[PDB]
Design a binder for this molecule. Structure first.
Ligand SMILES: [Br-]
Ligand SMILES: [Br-]
Ligand SMILES: [Br-]
Ligand SMILES: [Br-]
Ligand SMILES: [Br-]
Ligand SMILES: [Br-]
Ligand SMILES: [Br-]
Length: 250
């Protein structure tokens, strides 16, 4: 399975419930019993996301800029309100709003906390789970057109670290390589599930993800309140192009 690319959003709990309702997360389970054990974890994941405190964690790990209120006030006096245009003020504002991006270290700390709090570590196995968390920094900093491969995760993991797999073929204790080949397929699907159905929804719900330049350049993360300001300014600037380019051209 392919890891999806990072580039109003639904709460992760809504997205997770919907994928469990409408989709299957692996074609590689050996039997219904093994599938059911996976589904046990998914029910806990749903409950955890119902109870998680994103805003507290955002305040802790990815705080709004100390100048947020000033930036908010400045944007408000452009939108509400004037009659005429001032592009210099917007050049001063836009650039200052673009300067409020959240560091990758901060994003990764936030993300790792959410995954630790919400994804039971026995889903991947305790040691495998730590490997997964370690790889999230790379995920967070990846530019457009860049991607991780499932092999990037699972090559450093061990199927024998997973406690809940069902060895239907009775190969675990005597035929290691066959067991490993089979169960790596599931482990890989678990990696994809967490990234595509948990990590990406968490990032999209909590941040505006963009590039500072054009496509493929450095990834930038903004707090949603910051981007709501950026949105407000482009609306006014767009409505300026609906008056200056129309009324004067008549
Ligand atoms: Br499933
Ligand atoms: Br905050
Ligand atoms: Br990296
Ligand atoms: Br392995
Ligand atoms: Br377990
Ligand atoms: Br073997
Ligand atoms: Br999503």
């Amino acid at each position: 399975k392919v890891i999806q690319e990072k580039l109003k959003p639904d709460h992760p709990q809504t997205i997770i419930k919907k994928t469990l309702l409408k989709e299957y997360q692996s074609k590689n389970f050996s039997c219904q019993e093994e599938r059911d054990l996976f589904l046990e974890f998914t029910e806990k994941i749903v409950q955890n996301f119902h109870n998680i405190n994103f805003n507290y964690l955002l305040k802790k790990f990815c705080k709004l800029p100390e100048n947020y209120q000033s930036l908010k006030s400045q944007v408000k006096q452009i939108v509400q309100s004037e009659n005429k245009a001032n592009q210099q003020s917007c050049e001063n504002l836009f650039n200052s709003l673009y300067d409020t991006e959240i560091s990758y270290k901060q994003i990764t700390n936030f993300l790792r906390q959410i995954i630790q709090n919400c994804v039971p570590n026995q889903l991947l196995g305790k040691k495998n789970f730590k490997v997964f968390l370690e790889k999230l920094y790379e995920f967070v900093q990846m530019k457009r057109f860049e991607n991780q491969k499932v092999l990037d995760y699972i090559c450093f993991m061990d199927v024998f670290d997973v406690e809940w797999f069902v060895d239907l073929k009775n190969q675990k204790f005597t035929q290691k390589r066959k067991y490993i080949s089979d169960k790596r397929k599931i482990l890989g699907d678990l990696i994809v599930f967490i990234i595509n159905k948990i990590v990406i929804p968490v990032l999209r719900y909590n941040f505006y993800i963009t590039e500072k330049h054009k496509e493929g350049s450095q990834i930038f993360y903004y707090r949603k309140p910051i981007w709501k300001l950026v949105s407000k300014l482009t609306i006014v600037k767009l409505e300026e192009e609906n008056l200056e380019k129309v009324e004067e051209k008549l």
